[PDB]
């Protein structure tokens, strides 16, 4: 539990430092120094765009990995006595893997709207570019997180159903609906990811 | 107009792409080695039969290495800060993809190694599940390659 | 020991090598424009003309033929070893 | 050929004594399943329970004899006339008598083993005596106790002996130089001899109770040094003489076992045949009207005559009234598949046989697919050389299949490869063709009959000239413009695309579009097969109400995308990009699956109307008409004079599953293309990292070590490319088979074939 203690300590120390520096800044009538606008402006939109793309694919793939292993261990454990489940249950596995696919194609579409800048100043050069970069970063974060979470849900449900199949093999069809509901929830995530970056111009 | 510190992002993109994949491969190798050692105490003839999770981790490490080599060979002094962020994003993506793939590879390989030690007929089915793990890591690689140009 | 697996691996690797380096040597002799990146290059030859490029192409080709030569040599040695092992019994 | 092979069922009339002969003859023929007729048996009503018990006893005797023989390391070579004859009832007694003589010999061997255990105890005493010969040097009321104890109990002994003390413990001892195998246990147990000089009578009792609780075998070694030598020599002489006697007796036993291996193999076949016969008789039914027996038989229509021939054997020697009659009823009688009748191509079926098709003649699996199956386009990695390597390996292995099957197997993986040799070879041929069309031989392209493109027309006409050294100083990797050019490779992809640096983008677009077209046509064919599958099984309501919506929706949503891809490919040219220089494609993805409004860009006349019409016919109409089904008949049924709930809920779940699965499988068809790109990049990087290093200047130094570098290349190409990535694609395409390709026309499971093939050799 030492790692948990270290993480909690870092969390609480950083948040205490942040609240104390905020109260010091607002007390000392030094509000103008704590400029969020300058941070969001002078920062390059390319970092936001590329980080959004990377997270969009990476969260998807790691959620899919969580699902596939959390269901594969269950399958291999429950398949010792009944070898027939070693393949028939696979219909609930590809979901997770297909969930990861919902990232890469998505990771293409956002990446389809990346252009160079050849500009440095932020005054009237980059307003639409700023919006495009932030919007595509948000869409990437949305798809990545939603896809990861739906992957872990689908893997959990698939492991449960696979262990259910170990006793009565006739309930798999009656129980298939939950994981397709989870996959549909991932589809909602991908749909809103599409819509968020639907109308954005980059350049 | 070339901004300073531009190569920093690409350098850590390559470093992450190598390192995270290396860590995932190491975890997979460790878990599968523990599983093999546990299983070999009763079925000695089945040692080389299911050594393949180790080579799967090696494959993930190979994906990390090839992405890192490509990114490093694409590195120049005057990065326009548009290529560097692309390289960093691809590197981080492929690195965490390799980490997750190694995670799944290790866990499922240990489980399947124990199962095939217990039930000899379970190996081939395990194959399918295990192979899917690599695919996930593979996705990182491809999503890096397209990110190497656009 | 000169096990059957070792001899078979040596023979197949030798055959693989001889065919591939012969085809490399031929493709270098024609000087195909695909392996140009593979071919070594020095900046002082850029203005000299294609003659220097063809000269170094011939040099690397000859390197490939001698490589295939010792590949054939060790393949023949492996064949002799495996034939002696077979005829011993 | 045809995947129907109607099974049908039959009744098998029998007799009292003729039944055994007829059943043995049929088992020799082995073309019948013999579905059970009496379920309420539970062995208690098995009739021939005593025969089954005798068979079990014989099997136990055979297993014990075989285990003893394997411990003796004696071969079981029994080749020749293995299926001699099904065992008659009378000769079973003589075979059992011979087995009883063998068991008596085994019992004598067990008594010998007990005597050997006693001799091993004597040998342990002799070793403790050998230690006592050296303990006289240590001697120079310390209670001298020596004992034999397992090496595993040594540590705890230390913590369980010093703490009690009450006189202190002086444990000076050594261990046996080898892990002396205890014959009582039979394992190479690790032992040791512990010696202590604790104290007199009270600690003597304490040590004796410690040894009693700890199983340590204490020996009261005497103090005089003579008698130890003579009794050690005597026990050694007894040990060697008795060991020689026992070795001679067991050598005679194994000499008999040389022929007894084939003898008990034949006995095993006979007892297995008898057990199968009695199991079938238990499954068979006995009538009270006569002494005859009626057995339900699952036999093929073609083999029926041969079945009658079995009766011809019955009517000849044992009885004359044993016929068989085709039982053509419809209640239950779910026939087995039995359609898996084919030559080497049967390997294909095995890969399909991971699901157990069943469902009678509906089966439409491998033979329709074979080549167009996702198991011969299971390459997507063809590198010319990789294909030729796979073909060479498979061809050499097929040329050697005779001696390979004749010789013993190596490993289960080798067994799988042997089962797959045919598919491996034909996949190698297709990989060769795919490498040719891809024009990527070891990631290096091939220039055959021209290459198209040029540079001088691009620069002289295009004013991009005078870049000889300026292009090597000012325009590094800059020039990429088409002037007066065009014209595709007559066969594949130009090598110029390979040696370029925009290779990634063009190859990505080309592979993704090839992905879409191939996947759509494949899934269309898979769904179209279901129409024939269902028209064979009558059912006009499902044909005119359930699958027409599926095809309509699938076409209206995906064939439009395919046609758009082809139109984009054909209706443009190099000097036709909209304002911007290239734009790559710019229309493949912005035409999504919904395209709400706006869009702009490419808005060719009529496309909006076609899109809207396809959306309304597909998204709004197809799911709605996929509803109802049996209730439509139920109304008529309700007007004549089925569980609505389960029917409509199952139909609803199937409809949502299919409608989501169209998109899901369209996305999942993208998988093998990632393997294609990864394999291409892996080959290219391996080349540029090993071979590019290996070929350089200073020919002597550049080629003296070329052998080692090229051997490393061969090993890497075999390991990560040929096998690893090869296996990855091998199973990727099988998944594409089993998730979307074949999960469109055939559904369900059924019992496989089960004849009396005498699988036990």
Look up tokens 């800044």; give the residue.
A25
Cα–Cα distance measured from residue B62 to residue B51, given in angstroms and rounded to the nearest whole number: 17
> Tokens for D202?
């009270």
Cα–Cα distance measured from residue D84 to residue D79, given in angstroms and rounded to the nearest whole number: 12
Q: Is A64 on the interface with B (CB under 8 A)?
A: yes
Q: Which residue from D626, D644, D434 is spatially nearest to D545, judged by alpha carbons?
A: D626
Backbone angles phi, psi at D32, to 5 degrees: -135, 145
Chain B positions touching D508 (Cβ under 8 A) are 145-146
> Tokens for A133?
């970069």
Cα–Cα distance measured from residue D660 to residue D665, given in angstroms and rounded to the nearest whole number: 9
> CB–CB of B135 and D732 under 8 A?
yes
Cα–Cα distance measured from residue A182 to residue A179, given in angstroms and rounded to the nearest whole number: 5
Chain B positions touching D674 (Cβ under 8 A) are 135, 138-139, 141-142
Identity of the residue in D674, D681, D727 whose CB atom sits nearest the CB atom of B139: D674
Cα–Cα distance measured from residue D447 to residue D494, given in angstroms and rounded to the nearest whole number: 7
Cβ atoms of D676 and D381 closer than 8 Å: yes
Burial of D181 (0-12, 13-18, 19+ CB in 10 A): middle
Chains C and A touch (3+ CB pairs under 8 A): no
Q: Is D657 on the interface with A (CB under 8 A)?
A: yes
Q: Is A76 on the interface with B (CB under 8 A)?
A: yes
Nearest residue on chain B to A75, judged by CA atoms? B126
Cα–Cα distance measured from residue B107 to residue D356, given in angstroms and rounded to the nearest whole number: 30
Cβ atoms of D720 and D712 closer than 8 Å: no
Cα–Cα distance measured from residue D698 to residue D695, given in angstroms and rounded to the nearest whole number: 10
Nearest residue on chain D to B48, judged by CA atoms? D411
Chain B positions touching A55 (Cβ under 8 A) are 93
> CB–CB of D411 and B48 under 8 A?
yes
Give every CB contact of residue D484 below 8 A, 6+ residues apart in sequence: D457, D461
Residue D602 CA from chain centroid, whole number = 51
How is chain D split among helix, strand and coil, in percent rounded to 5? Answer: 60, 5, 35
Cα–Cα distance measured from residue D516 to residue D589, given in angstroms and rounded to the nearest whole number: 12
Cα–Cα distance measured from residue D674 to residue D506, given in angstroms and rounded to the nearest whole number: 15
Technique used by the depositors: cryo-EM
Burial of D632 (0-12, 13-18, 19+ CB in 10 A): exposed
H or E, element range at D9: strand D9-13
B66 beta partners: none
D297 beta partners: D10
> CB–CB of C17 and D710 under 8 A?
yes
Name the packing angle between helices D503-536 and D644-668 (round to 10°). 150
> CB–CB of C46 and D469 under 8 A?
yes
CB atoms within 10 A of CB C21: 24
> Where does A49-165 show beta strands of DSSP type E?
none
- Helices marked H in D162-225 — which ranges? 201-214
> Tokens for A41?
């402006």
Does residue D723 sit in helix, strand or coil? helix
Chain B positions touching D689 (Cβ under 8 A) are 69
Give every CB contact of residue A54 below 8 A, 6+ residues apart in sequence: A140, B88, B89, B90, B92, B93
Give every CB contact of residue A48 below 8 A, 6+ residues apart in sequence: A133, A134, A136, A137
Cβ atoms of D258 and D74 closer than 8 Å: yes
Look up tokens 């193999």; give the residue.
D265
**What resolution (Å)?**
3.9
Backbone angles phi, psi at D176, to 5 degrees: -65, 140
Sign of CA dihedral D338, D342, D344, D346: negative
> Tokens for D7?
């099974």
H or E, element range at D194: strand D191-197
DSSP letters, D320-349, are: S---EEEE---SS----------STTHHHH
> Tokens for B89?
């994003």
Cα–Cα distance measured from residue B109 to residue D719, given in angstroms and rounded to the nearest whole number: 19
Cα–Cα distance measured from residue D44 to residue D441, given in angstroms and rounded to the nearest whole number: 69
Phi-psi region of D166 (alpha: psi -120 to 50; beta: other; left: phi over 0): left
Identity of the residue in B66, B134, B150 whose CB atom sits nearest the CB atom of D685: B66
Question: b vs e for D404-424, b when ≥16 Cβ sit within 10 Å of the residue's Cβ?
Answer: beeeeeeeeeeeeebebbbbb
Residue B128 CA from chain centroid, whole number = 18
Q: Is D589 on the interface with A (CB under 8 A)?
A: yes
Question: b vs e for D484-503, b when ≥16 Cβ sit within 10 Å of the residue's Cβ?
Answer: eeeeebeebbbbbbbbeeeb
Give every CB contact of residue D480 below 8 A, 6+ residues apart in sequence: D500, D502
Chain C positions touching D695 (Cβ under 8 A) are 38-40, 60, 63-64
- Helices marked H in B119-150 — which ranges? 123-147
3-state SS string for D575-636? HHCCCCCCCCCCCCCCCCCCCCCCCCCCCCCCHHHHHHHHHHHHHHHHHHHCCCCHHHHHHH
3-state SS string for D372-392? CCCCCCCCCCCCCHHHHHHHH
DSSP letters, D213-257, are: HHT-EEE---S-SHHHHHHHHHHHHHHHHHHHHHHHHHHHHHHHH
Backbone angles phi, psi at A87, to 5 degrees: -125, -35
End-to-end Cα distance, chain C: 16
DSSP letter, residue D295: E
Identity of the residue in C32, C35, C63 whose CB atom sits nearest the CB atom of D699: C63
Burial of B29 (0-12, 13-18, 19+ CB in 10 A): buried
Nearest residue on chain B to D681, judged by CA atoms? B66
Q: Is B80 on the interface with A (CB under 8 A)?
A: yes
* Length of chain C measured in residues: 89
> Tokens for D157?
């002994």
């Amino acid at each position: 539990t030492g790692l948990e203690l270290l993480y909690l300590g870092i969390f609480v120390a950083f948040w205490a430092c942040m609240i104390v520096v905020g109260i010091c800044y607002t007390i000392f009538d030094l509000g103008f120094r704590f400029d969020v606008a300058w941070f969001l402006t002078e920062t390059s939109p390319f970092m936001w765009s590329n980080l959004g793309i990377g997270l969009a694919i990476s969260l998807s793939v790691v959620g899919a990995a969580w699902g596939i292993y959390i269901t594969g261990s269950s399958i291999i454990g429950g398949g010792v006595k009944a070898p027939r489940i070693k393949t028939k249950n696979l219909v609930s596995i590809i979901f997770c893997e297909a969930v990861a696919i919902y990232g890469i194609i998505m990771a293409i579409v956002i990446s389809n709207m990346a252009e160079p800048f050849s500009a440095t100043d932020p005054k009237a050069i980059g307003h639409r570019n700023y919006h495009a970069g932030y919007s595509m970063f948000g869409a990437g974060l949305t798809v990545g997180l939603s896809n990861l979470f739906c992957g872990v849900c689908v893997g959990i449900v698939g492991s449960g159903a696979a262990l259910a199949d170990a006793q009565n093999p006739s309930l798999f069809v009656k129980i298939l609906i939950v994981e397709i509901f989870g996959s549909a929830i991932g589809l909602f995530g991908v749909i809103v990811a599409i819509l968020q970056t639907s109308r954005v111009k980059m350049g | 107009n070339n901004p300073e510190y531009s190569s920093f992002f690409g350098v850590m993109g390559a470093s992450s792409a190598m390192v995270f994949s290396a860590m995932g491969a190491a975890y997979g190798t460790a878990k599968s080695g523990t599983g093999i050692a546990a299983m070999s105490v009763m079925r000695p003839e089945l040692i080389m039969k299911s050594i393949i999770p180790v080579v799967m981790a090696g494959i993930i490490a190979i994906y990390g290495l090839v992405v890192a080599v490509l990114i490093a060979n694409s590195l120049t002094d005057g990065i326009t800060l548009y290529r560097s962020f692309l390289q960093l994003g691809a590197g981080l993506s492929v690195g965490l993809s390799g980490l997750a793939a190694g995670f799944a590879i290790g866990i499922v390989g240990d489980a399947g190694v124990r199962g095939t030690a217990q039930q000899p007929r379970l190996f081939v089915g395990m194959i399918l599940i295990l192979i899917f793990a690599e695919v996930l890591g593979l996705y990182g690689l491809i999503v890096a390659l397209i990110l190497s140009t656009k | 020991c000169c096990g059957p697996k070792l001899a078979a691996c040596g023979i197949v690797l030798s055959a693989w090598g001889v065919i591939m380096l012969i085809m490399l040597g031929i493709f270098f002799n024609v000087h195909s424009a695909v392996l140009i990146e593979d071919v070594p290059f020095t900046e002082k030859d850029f203005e000299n003309g294609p003659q220097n490029i063809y000269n170094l192409y011939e040099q690397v080709s000859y390197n490939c033929f001698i490589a295939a030569g010792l590949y054939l040599l060790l393949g023949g040695f492996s064949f002799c070893q495996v034939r002696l092992n077979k005829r011993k019994e | 050929l045809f995947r129907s092979e109607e099974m049908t069922l039959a009744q098998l009339f029998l007799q009292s004594e003729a039944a055994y002969c007829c059943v043995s003859e049929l088992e020799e023929l082995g073309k019948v399943q013999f579905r059970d007729l009496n379920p309420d048996v539970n062995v208690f009503q098995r009739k021939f329970v005593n025969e089954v018990r005798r068979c079990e006893e014989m099997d136990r005797k055979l297993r014990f004899v075989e285990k003893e023989i394997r411990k003796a390391n004696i071969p079981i070579m029994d080749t020749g006339e293995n299926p001699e004859v099904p065992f008659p009832r009378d000769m079973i007694d003589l075979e059992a008598n011979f087995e009883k003589i063998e068991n008596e010999l085994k019992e004598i061997n067990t008594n010998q083993e007990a005597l050997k255990r006693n001799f091993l105890e004597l040998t342990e005493l002799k070793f403790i005596l050998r230690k006592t010969q050296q303990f006289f040097d240590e001697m120079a009321r310390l209670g001298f106790v020596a004992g034999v104890i397992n090496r595993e109990r040594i540590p705890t002994f230390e913590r369980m002996l010093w703490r009690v003390c009450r006189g202190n413990v002086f444990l000076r001892q050594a261990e046996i130089e080898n892990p002396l195998e205890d014959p009582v246990t039979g394992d190479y147990v690790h032992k040791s001899v512990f010696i202590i000089f604790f104290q007199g009578d009270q600690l003597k009792n304490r040590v004796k109770k410690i040894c009693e609780g700890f199983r340590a075998s204490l020996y009261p070694c005497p103090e005089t040094p003579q008698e130890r030598k003579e009794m050690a020599s005597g026990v050694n002489t007894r040990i060697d003489d008795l060991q020689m006697v026992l070795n001679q007796t067991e050598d005679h036993r194994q000499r008999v076992l040389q022929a007894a291996a084939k003898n008990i193999r034949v006995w095993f076949i006979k007892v297995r045949k008898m057990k199968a016969i009695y199991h079938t008789l238990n499954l068979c039914n006995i009538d009270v009207t006569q002494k005859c027996l009626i057995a339900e038989v699952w036999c093929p229509v073609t083999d029926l005559d041969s079945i009658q021939f079995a009766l011809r054997r019955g009517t000849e020697h044992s009885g004359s009234t044993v016929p068989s009659i085709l039982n053509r009823m419809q209640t239950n009688q779910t026939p087995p598949t039995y359609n898996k009748t084919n030559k080497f191509t049967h390997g294909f079926q095995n890969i399909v046989d991971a699901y157990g098709i069943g469902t009678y003649r509906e089966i439409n699996p491998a033979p329709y697919t074979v080549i167009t199956f996702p198991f011969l386009f299971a390459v997507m990695f063809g590198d010319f050389g990789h294909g030729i390597l796979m073909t060479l390996f498979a061809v050499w292995m097929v040329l050697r299949e005779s001696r390979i099957l004749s010789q013993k197997n190596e490993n289960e993986m080798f067994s799988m490869v042997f089962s797959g040799r045919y598919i491996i070879l034909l996949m190698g041929l297709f990989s060769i063709y795919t490498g040719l069309i891809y024009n990527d031989c070891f990631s290096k392209s091939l220039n055959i009959f021209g290459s198209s493109w040029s540079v001088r027309p691009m620069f002289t006409i295009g004013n991009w000239t005078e870049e000889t050294l300026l292009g090597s100083s000012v325009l590094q990797l800059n020039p990429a413009i088409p002037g007066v050019f065009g014209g595709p490779y007559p066969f594949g992809i130009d090598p110029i695309w390979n040696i370029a640096t925009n290779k990634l983008t063009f190859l990505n677009s080309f592979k993704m579009k090839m992905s879409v077209i191939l996947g759509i046509i494949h899934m269309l064919f898979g769904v179209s097969l279901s129409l024939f599958n269902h028209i064979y099984f009558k059912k006009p309501l499902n044909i005119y109400f359930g699958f027409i919506p599926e095809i309509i929706f699938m076409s209206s949503l995906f064939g439009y995308l395919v046609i758009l891809i082809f139109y984009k490919w054909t209706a443009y040219d190099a000097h036709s990009s909209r304002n911007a220089p290239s734009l790559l494609i710019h229309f493949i993805n912005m035409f999504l699956f919904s395209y709400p409004e706006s869009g702009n860009a490419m808005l060719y006349s009529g496309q909006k109307g076609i899109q809207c019409f396809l959306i309304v016919v597909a998204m709004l109409c197809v799911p709605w008409m996929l509803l109802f089904k049996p209730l439509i008949l139920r109304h008529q049924y309700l007007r004549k004079k089925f569980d609505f709930g389960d029917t409509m809920v199952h139909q609803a779940i199937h409809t949502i599953e299919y409608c989501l699965g169209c998109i899901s499988n369209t996305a999942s068809y993208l998988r093998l293309w990632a393997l294609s790109l990864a394999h291409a990049q892996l080959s290219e990087v391996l080349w540029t990292m090993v071979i590019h290093i290996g070929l350089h200047v200073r020919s002597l130094a550049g080629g003296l070590g070329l052998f080692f570098i090229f051997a490393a290349f061969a090993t890497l190409t075999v390991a990560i490319l040929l096998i690893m990535e090869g296996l990855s694609a091998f199973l990727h395409a099988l998944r594409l088979h089993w998730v979307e390709f074949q999960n469109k026309f055939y559904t369900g499971t059924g019992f496989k074939f089960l004849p009396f093939s005498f699988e036990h050799i």
